[PDB]
Amino acid sequence: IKSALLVLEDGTQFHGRAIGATGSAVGEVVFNTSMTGYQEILTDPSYSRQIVTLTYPHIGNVGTNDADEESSQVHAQGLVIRDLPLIASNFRNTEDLSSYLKRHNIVAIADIDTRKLTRLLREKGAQNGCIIAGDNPDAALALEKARAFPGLNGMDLAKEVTTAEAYSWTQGSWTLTGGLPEAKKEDELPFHVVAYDFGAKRNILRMLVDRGCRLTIVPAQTSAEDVLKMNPDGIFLSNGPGDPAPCDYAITAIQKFLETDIPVFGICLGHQLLALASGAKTVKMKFGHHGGNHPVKDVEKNVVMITAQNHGFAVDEATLPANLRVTHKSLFDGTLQGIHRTDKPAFSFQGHPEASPGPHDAAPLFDHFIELIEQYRKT
């Protein structure tokens, strides 16, 4: 018997079993509806400081593998599941989930009523919590730490996971047949994009490369100036954890790029940033969007796409500046999903066009970005 316990801010306790590292974990608790893709999710930087709950009971069926890692590490503060399978059964598995968790030093709990947990969060909105896994998990203590959690509202997490120094990425997407490909040679990539790293998912980068982009990853706080100097064919604003709001540096910089003619594309946190820099307002959602079955309509074409979502904050549609047209909305709650500058070559998407995990439906969002780029070069 290896105990584990999860306590929410409200005092609600979930007793189960430890499946990861011994220790404690504190974070905002969220639920994810993805039936597949647990590894990619765990390795998503956007999950920093967040305790991840998966609705699909059986988590770990396929094991783990390096190819399924969205970042260099596990960003999830903790993992909450219903059942940890006896075995992993997939030709691609290189290590079982439990082993993997331990190795990444993640506090994880299994065997809890995840459903009850999910309905609670939906009903009452996000909550902060704490998981304690050890010999004698102290409930009171757990409550203490949860309660003491600062909260993600107003928390700038982007500066926390961003890269120390700039770097170049030239690697493309995985194939069943060829796995993860060998990094391309610079002369092979037509365009050169500059990517702000606000805790970037490797699949975004890879898919950009697939489109003929050679990247230059830059720290979050990099100055527009320093950037402009590079002569970018395009600028990209990545996804990331925390409140987009407090990231003044980025906002400021973006504003600077907006005065130029250089194409700009932001995904998720980068969508929020763009919006902010355009004079819009962001809010913290009740429980947010985390899953991969989210319908999003391209209001323009009147077509729906099933998308991969992962956000706790959104852009207020009602405060949008006139230079900011709406391009996409959620079919689930009507929330703002995409926007494009009426006057500039800048646009963004709240969801994850790069999926990973998730439906490939929204991939073409990248395509538009390329267009902008190719046309920017024409000029």
Add this chain to the structure above:
Amino acid sequence: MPKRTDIKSILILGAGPIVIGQACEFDYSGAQACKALREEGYRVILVNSNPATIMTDPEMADATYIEPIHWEVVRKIIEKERPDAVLPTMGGQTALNCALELERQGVLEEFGVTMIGATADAIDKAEDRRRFDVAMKKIGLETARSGIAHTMEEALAVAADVGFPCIIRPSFTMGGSGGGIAYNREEFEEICARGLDLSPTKELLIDESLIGWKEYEMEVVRDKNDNCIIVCSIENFDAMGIHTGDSITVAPAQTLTDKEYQIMRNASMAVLREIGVETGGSNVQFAVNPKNGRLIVIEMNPRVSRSSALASKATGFPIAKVAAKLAVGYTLDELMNDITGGRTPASFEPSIDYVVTKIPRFNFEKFAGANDRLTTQMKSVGEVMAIGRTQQESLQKALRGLEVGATGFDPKVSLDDPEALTKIRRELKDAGADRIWYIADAFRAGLSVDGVFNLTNIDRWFLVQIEELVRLEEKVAEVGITGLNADFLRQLKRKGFADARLAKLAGVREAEIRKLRDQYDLHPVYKRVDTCAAEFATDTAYMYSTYEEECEANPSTDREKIMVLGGGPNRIGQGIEFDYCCVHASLALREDGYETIMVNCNPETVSTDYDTSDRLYFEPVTLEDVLEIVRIEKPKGVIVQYGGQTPLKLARALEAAGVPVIGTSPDAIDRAEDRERFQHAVERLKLKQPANATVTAIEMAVEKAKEIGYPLVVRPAMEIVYDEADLRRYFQTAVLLDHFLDDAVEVDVDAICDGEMVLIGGIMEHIEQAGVHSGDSACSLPAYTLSQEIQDVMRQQVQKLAFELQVRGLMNVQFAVKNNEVYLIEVNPRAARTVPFVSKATGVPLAKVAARVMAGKSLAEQGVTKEVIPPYYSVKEVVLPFNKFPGVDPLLGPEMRSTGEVMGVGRTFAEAFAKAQLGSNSTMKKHGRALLSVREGDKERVVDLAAKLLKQGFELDATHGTAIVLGEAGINPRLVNKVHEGRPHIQDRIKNGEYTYIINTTSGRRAIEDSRVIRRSALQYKVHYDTTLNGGFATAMALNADATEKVISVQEMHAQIK
């Protein structure tokens, strides 16, 4: 975008009688479509020869046609109704096939009927194996190495090329109809010949083997705007090589990485796009090599399926309702999601927080000489579904809900059997219906997970799970009841162990475990189905039990509730008829104001549609599961009289345990079912019963039998012994003894009793004599030969019996009429399979009326007090599964083997029979050569039959003794040699297409086993045959009518009634 306007009226092609491979799933889907289109204000016209369907209830559509599903007949319906469009994707293969014939025959053009949901070309593209293969290659999807054949010569060369073993798949078939696995040339020619003939397009697809790869299915929906969704993914438990319908399957997929899932999801959509399905749902099947993720496209079905029903139940996403709406111009984003209170659109992909398990239901014990091994051709007669938070929990619940007497992983072999490992091995290697239990036995016997994998190819992910359960059972056996502390017991419950299973292991009574649970306060909680993994709230109460923390049942304190127990999976004899009653009880009482609670786990049925009731418990219909629901719902009454045997066997225990059972008492039921109690009641009432005895020993029977008199009806399986020598003979291979009533008319009587009066629902005269199971007999309403005086006598006995037995609701009485004498065969104190047919024939919803009675409202009070005798004849005919089990002798007898039935409506008996016959898919012609080969006692009436055939223009052939008889009467048929006689023989003649009709009546085990070739050949060659002289006369009569001459709607039928 919104509904189409150049469409007002729509004809929906129904599926026809239930057969293996094409079951209840179509009444569910057909009903959903009716409902959907009707809701949208369209004029609905449908055709379905199957009377036991809710879809054919007069109140579900505008023009209901219970007529044979033949293009010529359908033509008359179109000509008469002039529908604008036709929706052919809701009635399985029958509907697709029929829509295309109608198209081929130019009928659609002729009346300006538009094909909606899918187009004729799309259909063919998917249906034509060659075309489908070509399309996959065009879209870069991989298919197994294969080749097309249209002849045996051609097929042989494909084989030569792919080698053995190889997979044979006819074009324009499903449920593996006409296919199989050929391990050798012999097997190979048999299958190929069979499928070429069966194939509507006379075309096969022969593939190399992928046996053992993983099998997957995806349910897709696409709108005209090109929106596309995955409603559900299914991972099969049983690997490729065993048809999806005969496999254990689960949702969602379990062992695919997200990366693999996306590729499969993308492919799925690509396939629909390429085939051309633009407005509906489709199923896409694949094969995955577990070793390298290699993906292969198997097929696609351009319509709703058995999988789509399972998928709708599993997710809560009403596929068919949605598709019907899309068929008329609606788009996904425009439709609302039913269960999420309409708060969200239908344009989304469902997410579920539990595991869904489907287990097929077989009936091999009913087909002795059949090949009982699982293959690519479906053999299952039904299926069960279960929901659990875990796979363990999900699987065990399904096991216990299958209705085969299992409480879970009950043992099949003895631990201390020296040959056990050998038997297990075989069962594993060559899968039969019992494999799942043998898997557990294997682990008990010391075989490892890898050893089991190697034999079965079932993913280790599932296997380890089963092993763990065994290991847990062994502890239970060791610790016994004393070891059953709260902690452990709870662990056990969480893994889905049944109280009954635990009791057996612990060596106690099931009620002791249940008591133990009450002590510890160890009860399940109920979760709801919501399509989104709790991300959104739901107002629907579609629930399942699980051992968790939070309960979502939230029962009302408000209304008086009425619980209706379902029959679980369908099996031969316990079909859709019982579910139709269940559905009507719910619809009636709900309409009457009660709060209706349904308990069932059959994924194929309308009973398990969230729409049918107020509350739905998708649970195994067992004492344990039911008590738990009762425990929390505290209903006013429970109806156990409508779901067949299942709920019936529970009645006593339920009552004992304090359940408020309504209608006929469990005691009352027992009175009727207990042959002893019964014999006293008949006795009590001074009624006639065949002489009977209860023999213990052989030599006791031989004596008693002398007493009783031959022939004899030995009832433990049932047989009919003719002589003393026959008795022993039986005894060898081999108790109630019953004088068999030779040359007697069998009759069914359906009625209702409210304790005050008895209402005669209907008197049905079977065509086949007593001896041929009532369930396999054709029948007439009203009687076609029975005198009024005698029927009156039966009506009286029904009354007497009703009161005496204390009937409260439905009852059915079976009689035999011999020499103007009424004999009682049996009394079934509940709703019978004939109930829906009688309701259809008479216009009275017996199930609804009887439900009200049970609930407390009298016949007088409801105003249903007079027996209805319609103005037209109603004939019922059955469909038998023999063509699925070639080894089996396609002969009728005392045991029921049919899967479905049809209804024929005519101005005369002849016309009604004609329609019924054609409706049953009879190959009967009005010309040709007939073959007569009858038994002794028939040799006398045959003459008249012969003359009748002669009058029609048939030529006759006959065997020796038959020819002798005819000759003496002045009819000289052409002599034909029995096989042992020389040549040519019947077998030869039959095979060479000489005959268009066969009449063969046999008597005596030996005479039967002898004549087995005639029947077998007739079936193989598709010649219409009758195995009863009585049946022959009916056939004869029907030659004088034209089933395509006139069609009538149910609404019109009901209107002629006075």
